[PDB]
C-alpha cells in the first residue's frame, strides 16, 4: 500500500527507534509541503557548459514520450 511504500523508502534512506524517527521526519516534511520545457532548459545549460551528454539526455526524453516522475527527477537534480 502507499503507507507500506513510504516505510520502505525510509528504510532505504536509513535501529527500530531510528527508523520510527526517520518516518516521523518524512511525515512532517510531507505536511509542510501540503515538464518537457523544463528538461530542455536544463539541457541548454549543459550545452553551454558536455554537448554530447546533452544530446543523449534529449534522446532519452524523446524515447520516454511518467511526466510527474520526470518532473520529480528534474526537481531532485
Amino acid at each position: 500500500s502507499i503507507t507500506q511504500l513510504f516505510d520502505d523508502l525510509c528504510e532505504a534512506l536509513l535501529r527500530k527507534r531510528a527508523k520510527r524517527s526517520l518516518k516521523k521526519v518524512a511525515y512532517n516534511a510531507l505536511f509542510t509541503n501540503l515538464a518537457r520545457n523544463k528538461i530542455l532548459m536544463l539541457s541548454f545549460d549543459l550545452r553551454v557548459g558536455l554537448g554530447p551528454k546533452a544530446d543523449r539526455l534529449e534522446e532519452l526524453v524523446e524515447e520516454l514520450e511518467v511526466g510527474s516522475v520526470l518532473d520529480l527527477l528534474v526537481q531532485l537534480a
Partner: protein, 76 residues
C-alpha cells in the same frame, strides 16, 4: 536566467520543438560595425538617414554596444 529569456523570446516570436531548436543553436569592432551599417545605408540609397544614424550612435554612448548593433544590422 539566459535560458528563461530565450524561452520568453521564442514565445513572443510565436512550440517546444522550436524552443529545443533555439537551445541547440545557442549551444552551437564597434567602429567597424558602424562603418558597415553606413555602407549598407549607402547601398539602400538614404544619405540623410545615414547622418541621423551617426548622431544616434553618439547619443547611445553618452547615455556590449557592438553586439546590439550587429544584431540590428543582421535584421536589415
Amino acid at each position: 536566467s539566459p535560458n528563461v529569456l530565450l524561452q520568453n523570446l521564442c514565445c513572443r516570436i510565436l512550440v517546444a520543438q522550436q524552443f529545443q531548436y533555439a537551445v541547440r543553436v545557442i549551444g552551437s569592432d564597434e567602429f567597424l560595425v558602424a562603418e558597415k551599417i553606413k555602407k549598407e545605408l549607402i547601398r539602400q540609397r538614404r544619405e540623410a538617414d545615414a547622418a541621423l544614424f551617426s548622431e544616434l550612435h553618439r547619443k547611445l554612448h553618452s547615455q556590449n554596444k557592438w553586439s546590439i548593433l550587429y544584431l540590428l544590422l543582421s535584421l536589415s
